[PDB]
Design a protein around this nucleic acid. Structure first.
Ligand SMILES: [Zn+2]
Ligand SMILES: [Zn+2]
Ligand SMILES: [Zn+2]
Ligand SMILES: [Zn+2]
Lengths: 734, 1249
RNA sequence: UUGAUGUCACGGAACCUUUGUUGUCUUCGACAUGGGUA
């Protein structure tokens, strides 16, 4: 016990020796800290034996009389725990106890260094909240730099103080904040001092040599051992040094080694360092960044979580888009570029808070098979933050569908928006077409365009539509004209031959545009007059199947504002009181034709929380995904206004969101029909009545579009064209 | 040539200002400079010092005028008088030269392209823009241009945070200055025109100037036409000279609390006697005299001067006292700096939208009434005495910040829509429902007439293991009172027909009384209610209405608001789609049948009454006055409920009371919140359903050796009285979220905790060891029977066994009143006692029902009034609400003495410092203490002992946590924490201290009050034959202190303490009933030295309660034995035990045990087992050395019939007795020699004559 | 003390976590004085 230890130390005390005084002070401070925190040791209710001698010794010791050594030892005791929570709480305690002692004017170098290191570690341990770095982290690094600066005001060549200062400066540079003052001068004072054999100073030495053109340390850097646990850091630093030494073959070999041996979580700084290295090599005109970027993308694409069929999940990384921009430009083959572009579509990326929320929902829904994997991902991401500082390194694929599966009477069109290329002043857009009835070598084409004006017009139309609803038909017309003017190759008849339906696979904001309704500049012709159209969220969802066999229909409606004449008083069965129970029964019934005319509400933070508004209940899309014994193979679905209702406003041009279309695609639904924006009730009634009256859906949609576009063109009515426009088909049955 | 135009702007609210920066930093890459662009500016006369004045630039006014002109043009469909207006130009080829660009969407009213770049004429809008200087906007400055020392001379800096919605905690903030409009209400400038501007352009400029409604973050109207240091030094010097340095913090707190009024100085408390000899205010001149003259001085006569004087003294004393510590210095305010500014992007796309020609403004007016205390955090860095502080204006008035009101509106709108907004600072505006609604809302800043000082509450933290307050856990918080009324105003400019449905629903929620608007909402702070609401709609699309609005400036000054309020209509619209609130109210009713107390040392020291402990009282704002009322703290209630919830739940085998709860996700954290989250339940203060005044109860500590009152602080408390016949009713409510009410697990946990609290296991308030705060029942309402569902054999007890004590009583000899019981020389100590953090397995928790029956006249005087029957004093039997009672402290002490003697524990209460009596440091101190013996006594020299009385007994038998008796002074180690270890025993706690507790450990037994169960039977008939509830008087003989020198004759080392004093049972009260003396037989005469009392007779019956928790089988066996001793033994209780008064007997009748949280069992069929286990434990400790047990049984042997022993003290000499008995003078040189005295006094029942 | 064809800062709640608790019968009999004596 603390009292027993104090008694033992007091028994053998020498007033001229030092070690006795340090031990006695350490025991007293330990007892006082144990008194500070309400631990279980407070139940001890004894005193000290030999009262006169003990009192005399205590009085003499207090009259004669380190804090810094004790708190240092506490710090190294903290620096080898297994749990980040334990490390964090211990660091909080250490900082809280050291504040006043350091604030005292006559503070010592050991005390100030300990506090600075504690601040640096706590700043490193901070967690993310949203789209930007926390401010507490930056303030912690600033505090560490302030402590090092006050130490360096008095003393000049403190190795550890200079190292901590440089670590804080480099981490600030890694964050959005720019460098501090005198950074080059300090980096020059430490370069002059000497050479340390540490992974976490090799970065500083690499920066110094790359800045001041001094390759003296590269020999020592390259001649390091290979008996460590973070071998990828050695491989990357050796590759950089060899590149400074022009030993390009060695650079390459270290490149494949580093890419082959890499960690899982993206919180490790290794991935950011790799991306920075690739960008530097590209800027320096060395033609091996292409192969390095290709291999890095190939390694990186396999990190994802499978929830539900045809749906995948991932954790957010800032530079993934940039890396996928660097790999796309590196690739030369058109088919490989198409694969790289398709690697991003139909994928959901979430943050720590969203992952925790979905884990809680799964726990409430009793899904161990998913909860365990979520906990593994969360704890891995949490633990992989300070692995570089603490010298630790804790430890699938999917099949590819050949492009030859397309029929002989179809054309496939892919899209991809290269943000980095657009920022470089070039044409960021890319249209990648494919043609089955041509020579094997000449079966692919690459077309480029600019999308800045199109994005501006889309934003203007979206703002107007949100503000005044129907008072934006002219803006929609302008948007369609902009689409046609920005992609003129659709109307040349040599790239896309006549009588050949097209299959659109958009990427980014192009999902929410009517590409099938492009207007060519009073003679005006519409795109749909020449070819039909289909849509797919991604190419890897391609899986043709036949239709159903039994004949039946079902209607699920929660719309009291409008009564659908033909739909209700017709051939299909009517269920006005549509509850979640009856909805589940309908999905499990496997009908031939299904309709769902209800409302919805979006969710901008968690995509899985978007709700369908039913009678006295709200059914999230996640609940739709997690339904047992679902039978919908080879069945058509007509949907309603909910799909257009639960779409959040777009913010970034390369953003994507999941909806009921994807939810029903996960159930292998034969087809889906839905609108892009708020549809009209009477037009919905007429169109769906025609669609259920006939069998084929593509022919129905084409004939209906021609029938009503005749009436439109008879008078040039933008308000009517606004009603004709929002209609499309998703899926590809047999 | 040009023409000038004077301009003046008058703010209706405080406006924000930015800090000075160097010209090098004044660029577009500086985030702070870019952020501080819409505020005012500070100009320095010279850049060395901060002397200067503020100003406003003309560019901001130009931008505001342009925005107003655009709004007017879209309202008017692009026409001024006869000329159409082009949409203007906002495109620049060289963007790098522009410090700031436009992010909002420009308004659209026409389809024509802008004018040509080079043209001979321009539209009025283009002329106003300046595409041809046409219009020049000057700088706005104060009239006369005065100079101030710095920015802090006109305003103060305030922190403004951003609160996360999902969690409920802020992670970043920013700072800005604030200047009050009362002192700095107006600025003036000029506008110059080039004498060629069209009349249409001038009309548009005038209309835009009138339409501009706010600037610099405030609403505006634009028209065109030193004894404290000395006193602190004196007080500190006096305290240092008198060595009373430990009371500095308490003195500072008292002096600070005196700021309420100067009349409190005249009514400072006094000592018990009534003279000016207080332990705090008369340390010295004296502190009382210093404060008196300070209040007397003419310059401090003023109230504000007195207030600032008291605050300065408190701060100075606090800073002086802070440095006296000698250990680790912890800091609780840490790791909060998260300053962050928005970053407006420069690559933003340019957009244009058409909102339409329809526009309506809806005005809403009312009040905001504070139903509970509120707390708006605003901590000043210079004032360090108080931890948490509130926001006040420069004239010391409460404030209701627009920032807080707007944030609460945004939170409520998000709650209604059920869709959090994840927008980030910078970029184009967000386009969600909440942001769209909030973009058109305007709110005002209010203040109150009430300007009294704030009231401050203290808070602590309880150690779950030892049961006492945690070490170094004390902090205080300022709280504003309840009942303050703030004016309320709200304007919504939008295109919708009336207000939105979401706003209507939120306003209805506020009207119903769910405006949780302030901080500290967990402890029930800041609930408001909207009342006297009025509203109207104004259609600005109409030409005449728009012209009237522009002419009257929209009625924002008071002179227009007066007419607008006349035009207003009473009521509020009902919503179309109403959604229920997120919180539900639960009512609480508590019934208490015992006294109650909630300590507050600051009020105890400040109040005129000299009581040590007082109850908590809070003030209510009645207009511009205050009204104290007694209540129970919401913090204390929350702590009790949380402990009850935690102590019965476990996580992976670990009780929740042991976990750190830092970054935790346990049931307790999810329900009650944590540092990283917000709680889901809010507690409010409870108020009694009456206005009962406090009473006064006084106590005393009895020395175990002398038998008199130890020289301790005679203490008293002021609880609120209660009785079984007149219980205390306590009422209140707490709020619970709907999700918690839906969660079955949380409902079950809360129900279990409430059931345990209702069963009577968790007392409320302090001093519960003596029966204070016993909850009789508890119930709740308004939960739809979801939590109250869980809030829902008698064999004859064995009789006592016959005693074995045998004593021979002759009928010729006279005996002595008291004898000593010599204890064993072995005490069984233990270092670690049982913990309070859970209900340990294998231990028993339950209740005991006792039954006390009187056998001899009992006296328990009521000392509130010392002249009941008419110098000569008089007293009456203890009564409370006209009901005869016995306090629980008397029974606790009576049982504790016998338990200590049985278990052979330490002397629990003892006077170690007393020194008896009959160059080096030893000689002088003996001389200094000798003069006080001569100079103070009611009645060759003394033989002063060289050692204190504490050294005259075995070290094992001294108190465990005692005083310092060894040579040397511990005053050196006052600051250092190791002082306590030099006072405690090296081996731990004895069995008595384990059960009844000590100063650093909580006990495990609680004693309740006792009630008489029948009509009283008085010893003497009363004055009124028709009043059987009052008795007559009886005159007792003289009573005097004991003399310890009788049991310790000489100073030789062979004399030691003999043991514990005990009194015998006899029938000498018969002579006291008559007028005869006990021993001389003469008549007792009235004198101012003796007393008169009211006494009961035999046969009366009482009954009381004992509660215990975590007791082993052997511990409970000995406790029951100490109550029901034997058949033929009796206790002693009350006053005048030496004369025979006050022999009682206890009889146990029922024992009930606790099995789990719901099921209780009758434990009457296990008393023989516990008694057997108790005796076995004594055998192993003492095999056959059990002689103190039988000596105790001899002294407690009650005489039977056919026996009448004669017991009385001897007289001094043989010349003063009619009976011819021996005397003290001849007994000393007789059988009672010095070398044989101790042997005689140790044998029970031995005669002296 | 501003600079001009471009300022949503009424674009941001100082927010979140801690029982003034613990220990005490309003109790009661031996002297007091300096020398006395020599
Ligand atoms: Zn113009
Ligand atoms: Zn928003
Ligand atoms: Zn917890
Ligand atoms: Zn003890």
């Amino acid at each position: 016990n603390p009292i027993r230890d104090i008694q033992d130390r007091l028994k053998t005390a020498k007033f001229d020796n030092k070690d006795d005084m340090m031990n006695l002070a350490s025991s007293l401070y330990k007892y006082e800290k144990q008194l500070m925190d309400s631990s279980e040791a407070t139940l001890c209710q004894q005193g000290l034996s030999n009262r006169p001698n003990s009192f005399s010794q205590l009085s003499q010791f207090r009259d004669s009389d380190q804090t810094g050594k004790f708190w240092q030892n506490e710090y190294e005791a903290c620096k080898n725990f297994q749990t980040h929570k334990e490390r964090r709480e211990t660091l909080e305690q250490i900082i809280r106890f050291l504040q006043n002692g350091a604030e005292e004017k006559d503070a010592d170098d050991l005390l100030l260094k300990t506090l600075a290191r504690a601040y640096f570690h706590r700043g490193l341990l901070y967690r993310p909240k949203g789209f930007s770095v926390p401010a507490r982290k930056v303030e912690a690094m600033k505090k560490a730099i302030a402590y090092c600066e006050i130490i360096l005001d008095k003393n000049e060549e403190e190795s550890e103080a200079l190292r901590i200062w440089l670590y804080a400066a480099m981490e600030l540079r890694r964050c959005g904040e720019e460098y501090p003052e005198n950074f080059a001068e300090k980096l020059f004072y430490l370069a002059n001092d000497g050479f340390i054999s540490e992974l976490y100073d090799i970065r500083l030495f690499l920066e110094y040599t790359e800045r001041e053109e001094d390759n003296n340390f590269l020999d020592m850097i390259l001649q390091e051992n290979q008996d460590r646990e973070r071998l990828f850091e050695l491989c990357l630093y050796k590759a950089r040094a060899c590149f400074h030494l022009n030993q390009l073959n060695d650079v390459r070999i270290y490149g494949e080694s580093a890419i082959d041996n890499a960690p899982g979580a993206f919180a490790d700084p290794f991935w950011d360092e790799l991306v920075e290295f690739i960008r530097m090599l590209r800027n320096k005109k060395s033609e091996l960044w292409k192969e390095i970027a290709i291999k890095a993308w190939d390694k990186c694409r396999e990190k994802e979580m499978k929830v539900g069929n045809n749906i995948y999940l991932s954790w957010y990384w800032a530079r993934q888009r940039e890396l996928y921009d660097l790999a796309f430009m590196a690739q030369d083959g058109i088919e490989k570029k198409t694969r790289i572009a398709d690697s991003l579509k139909s994928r959901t990326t979430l943050r720590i808070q969203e992952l925790n929320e979905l884990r809680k929902d799964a726990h409430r829904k009793q899904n161990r098979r998913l909860e365990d994997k979520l906990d593994r991902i969360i704890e891995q991401e949490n633990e992989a933050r300070d692995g570089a500082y603490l010298r630790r390194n804790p430890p699938g694929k999917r099949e590819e569908i050949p492009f030859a599966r397309l029929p002989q009477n179809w054309i496939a069109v892919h899209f991809y928006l290269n943000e980095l290329e657009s920022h470089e002043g070039g044409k960021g857009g890319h249209a990648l077409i494919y043609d089955p009835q041509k020579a094997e070598k000449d079966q692919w084409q690459d077309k480029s365009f600019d999308y800045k004006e199109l994005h501006r017009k889309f934003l203007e139309w979206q703002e107007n539509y949100i503000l005044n609803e129907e008072g934006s038909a002219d803006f929609l017309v302008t948007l369609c004209r902009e689409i046609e003017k920005a992609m003129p190759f659709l109307f040349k008849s040599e790239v896309i031959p006549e009588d050949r339906p097209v299959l659109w696979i958009p990427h980014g904001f192009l999902h929410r545009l009517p590409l099938h309704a492009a207007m060519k500049s009073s003679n005006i012709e519409i795109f749909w007059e020449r070819h039909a159209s289909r849509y797919l969220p991604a190419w890897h969802l391609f899986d043709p199947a036949p239709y159903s066999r039994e004949e039946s229909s079902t209607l699920l409606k929660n719309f009291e504002e409008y009564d659908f004449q033909n739909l209700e008083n017709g051939e299909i069965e009517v269920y006005a009181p549509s509850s979640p129970k009856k909805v589940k029964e309908a999905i499990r019934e496997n009908p031939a034709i299904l309709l769902l005319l209800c409302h919805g509400e979006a969710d901008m933070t968690n995509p899985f929380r978007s709700c369908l508004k039913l009678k006295n209940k709200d059914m999230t899309i996640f609940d739709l995904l997690t339904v047992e014994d679902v039978r919908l193979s080879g069945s058509r679905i007509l949907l309603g206004a909910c799909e257009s209702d639960m779409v959040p406003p777009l913010e970034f041009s390369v953003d994507e969101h999941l909806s009921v279309s994807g939810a029903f695609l996960s159930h292998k639904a034969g087809e889906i029909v839905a609108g892009l924006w708020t549809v009209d009730s009477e037009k919905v009634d007429e169109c769906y009545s025609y669609l259920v009256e006939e069998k084929d859906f593509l022919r129905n949609l084409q004939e209906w579009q021609m029938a009503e576009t005749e009436n439109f063109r008879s008078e040039n009515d933008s308000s009517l064209f606004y009603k004709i426009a929002p209609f499309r088909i998703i899926g590809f049955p047999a | 040539m040009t023409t000038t135009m004077k301009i003046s702007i008058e703010f209706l609210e405080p406006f924000r200002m930015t800090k000075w920066q160097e010209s090098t930093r004044r660029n577009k890459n500086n985030k702070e400079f870019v952020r501080g662009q819409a505020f005012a500016r500070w100009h320095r006369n010279k850049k060395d010092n901060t002397k200067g004045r503020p100003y406003i630039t003309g560019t901001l006014l130009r931008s505001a005028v342009i925005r107003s002109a655009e709004n007017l043009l879209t309202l008017s469909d692009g026409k001024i008088s006869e000329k159409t207006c082009c949409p203007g130009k906002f495109d620049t080829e060289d963007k790098d030269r522009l410090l700031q660009l436009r992010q909002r969407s420009t308004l659209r009213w026409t389809d024509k392209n802008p004018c040509p770049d080079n043209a001979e004429t321009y539209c009025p809008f283009c002329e106003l823009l300046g595409r041809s200087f046409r219009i020049h906007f000057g700088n706005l400055s104060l009239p006369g241009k005065p100079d101030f020392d710095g920015p802090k001379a006109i305003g103060s800096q305030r922190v403004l945070n951003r609160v996360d919605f999902k969690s409920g905690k802020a992670h970043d903030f920013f700072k800005a200055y604030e200047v009050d409009h009362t002192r700095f209400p107006r600025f003036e400038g000029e506008i110059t025109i080039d004498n060629k501007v069209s009349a249409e352009a001038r009309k548009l400029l005038c209309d835009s100037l009138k339409f501009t409604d706010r600037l610099c973050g405030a609403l505006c109207v634009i028209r065109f036409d030193n004894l404290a240091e000395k006193t602190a030094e004196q007080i500190i010097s006096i305290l240092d000279d008198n060595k009373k340095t430990e009371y500095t913090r308490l003195l500072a707190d008292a002096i600070r609390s005196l700021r309420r009024s100067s009349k409190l100085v005249a009514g400072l408390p006094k000592d018990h006697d009534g003279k000016d000899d207080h332990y705090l205010w008369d340390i010295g001149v004296t502190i009382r005299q210093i404060l008196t003259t300070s209040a007397d001085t003419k310059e401090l006569k003023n109230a504000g001067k007195w207030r600032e004087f008291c605050e300065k003294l408190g701060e100075a004393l606090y800073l002086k006292s802070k440095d006296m510590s000698g250990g680790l210095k912890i800091t609780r305010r840490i790791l909060g700096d998260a300053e962050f500014h928005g970053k407006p992007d420069r690559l933003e796309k340019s957009r244009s939208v058409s909102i339409g020609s329809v526009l309506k403004e809806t005005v809403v007016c009312g009040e905001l009434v504070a139903k509970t205390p509120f707390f708006f955090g605003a901590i000043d860095e210079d004032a360090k005495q108080t931890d948490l502080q509130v926001l006040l204006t420069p004239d010391n008035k409460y404030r209701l910040p627009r920032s807080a009101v707007r944030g609460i509106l945004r939170r409520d709108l998000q709650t209604y829509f059920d869709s959090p907004c994840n927008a980030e600072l910078g970029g184009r505006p967000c386009m969600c429902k909440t942001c769209r609604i909030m973009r058109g809302i305007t709110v005002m800043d209010a203040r109150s007439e009430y300007n009294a000082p704030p009231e401050i509450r203290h808070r602590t933290r309880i150690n779950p293991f030892t049961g006492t307050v945690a070490e170094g856990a004390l902090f205080n918080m300022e709280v504003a009172p309840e009942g303050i009324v703030f004016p309320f105003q709200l304007r919504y400019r939008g295109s919708e027909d009336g207000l939105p449905d979401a706003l209507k629903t939120v306003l209805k929620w506020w009207a119903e009384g769910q405006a949780f608007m302030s901080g500290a909402a967990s402890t029930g702070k800041g609930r408001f209610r909207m009342e006297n609401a009025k509203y109207e709609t104004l259609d600005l699309s109409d030409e005449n209405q728009r012209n009237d609005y522009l002419k009257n400036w929209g009625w924002r000054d008071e002179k227009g608001l007066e007419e607008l309020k006349k035009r207003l209509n009473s009521g509020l619209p009902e919503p179309g789609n109403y959604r229920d609130p997120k919180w539900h109210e639960i009512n609480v009713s508590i019934e208490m049948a015992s006294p109650f107390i909630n300590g507050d040392p600051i009020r105890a020291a400040v109040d005129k009454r000299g009581t040590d402990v007082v109850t908590f009282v809070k003030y209510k704002a009645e207009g511009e006055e205050a009204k104290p009322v007694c209540a129970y703290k919401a913090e204390s209630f929350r702590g009790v409920i949380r402990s009850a919830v935690a102590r019965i739940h476990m996580e992976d085998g670990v009780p929740l009371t042991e976990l750190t709860h830092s970054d935790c996700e346990c049931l307790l954290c999810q329900i009650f919140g944590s540092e990283y989250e917000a709680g889901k339940i809010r507690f409010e203060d409870l108020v009694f359903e009456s206005d009962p005044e406090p009473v006064t109860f006084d106590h005393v500590a009895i020395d175990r050796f002398t038998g008199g009152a130890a020289d301790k602080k005679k203490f008293d408390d002021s609880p609120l009285p209660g009785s079984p016949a007149r219980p205390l009713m306590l009422k209140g409510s707490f709020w619970i979220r709907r999700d918690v009410l839906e969660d079955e697990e949380y409902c079950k946990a809360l129900g279990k905790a409430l059931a345990d609290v209702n069963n009577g296991l968790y007392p409320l308030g302090g001093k519960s060891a003596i029966g204070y705060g016993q909850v009789k029942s508890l119930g709740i309402k308004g939960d739809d029977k979801r939590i109250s569902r869980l809030m829902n054999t008698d064999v004859a007890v064995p009789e006592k066994p016959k005693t074995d004590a045998e004593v021979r009583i002759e009928a010729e000899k006279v005996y002595y009143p008291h004898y000593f019981v010599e204890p064993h020389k072995k005490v069984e100590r233990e270092e670690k006692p049982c913990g309070h953090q859970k209900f340990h397995e294998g231990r028993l928790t339950g209740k005991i029902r006792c039954k006390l029956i009187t056998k001899t006249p009992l006296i328990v005087p009521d000392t509130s009034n010392d002249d009941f029957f008419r110098y000569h004093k008089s007293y009456a039997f203890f009564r409370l609400h006209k009901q005869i009672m016995i306090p629980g402290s008397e029974l606790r002490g009576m049982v504790s003495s016998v338990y200590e003697t049985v278990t052979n524990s330490c002397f629990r209460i003892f006077d170690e410092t007393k020194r008896l009596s009959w160059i080096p440091e030893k000689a002088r101190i003996k001389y200094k203490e000798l003069l006080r013996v001569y100079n103070n006594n009611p009645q060759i020299s003394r033989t002063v002992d060289d050692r204190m009385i504490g050294k005259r007994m075995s070290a094992d038998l001294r108190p465990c946590h005692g005083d310092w008796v060894e040579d040397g002074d511990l005053s050196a180690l006052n600051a250092y924490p190791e002082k306590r270890l030099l006072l405690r025993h090296p081996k731990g706690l004895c069995p008595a201290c384990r059960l009844f507790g000590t100063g650093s450990y909580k006990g495990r037994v609680r004693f309740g009050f006792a009630s008489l169960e029948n009509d009283p039977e008085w010893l003497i008939p009363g004055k009124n034959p028709g009043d059987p509830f009052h008795g007559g008087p009886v005159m007792l003989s003289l009573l005097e202190r004991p003399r310890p020198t009788w049991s310790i004759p000489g100073s030789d080392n062979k004399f030691k303490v003999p043991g514990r004093k005990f009194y015998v049972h006899h029938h000498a009260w018969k002579t006291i009933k008559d007028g005869n003396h006990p021993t001389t037989g003469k008549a007792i005469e009235q004198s101012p030295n003796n007393r008169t009392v009211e006494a009961l007779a035999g046969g009366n019956s009482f009954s009381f309660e004992i509660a215990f928790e975590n007791l082993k089988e052997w511990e409970l066996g000995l406790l029951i034995h100490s109550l029901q001793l034997e058949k033929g033994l009796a206790h002693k209780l009350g006053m005048a035990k030496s004369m025979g008064f006050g022999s009682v007997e206890i009889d146990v009748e029922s024992v009930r045990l606790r099995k789990d949280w719901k099921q209780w069992r009758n434990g009457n069929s296990e008393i023989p087992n516990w008694l057997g286990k108790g005796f076995a434990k004594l055998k192993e400790w003492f095999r056959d050395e059990l002689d103190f047990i039988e000596n105790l049984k001899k002294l407690l042997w009650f005489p039977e019939g056919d026996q009448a022993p004669r017991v009385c003290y001897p007289m001094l000499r043989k010349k003063d007795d009619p009976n011819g008995n021996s005397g003290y003078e001849e007994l000393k040189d007789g059988e009672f020699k010095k070398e044989d005295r101790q042997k005689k006094l140790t044998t029970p029942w031995t005669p002296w004559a």
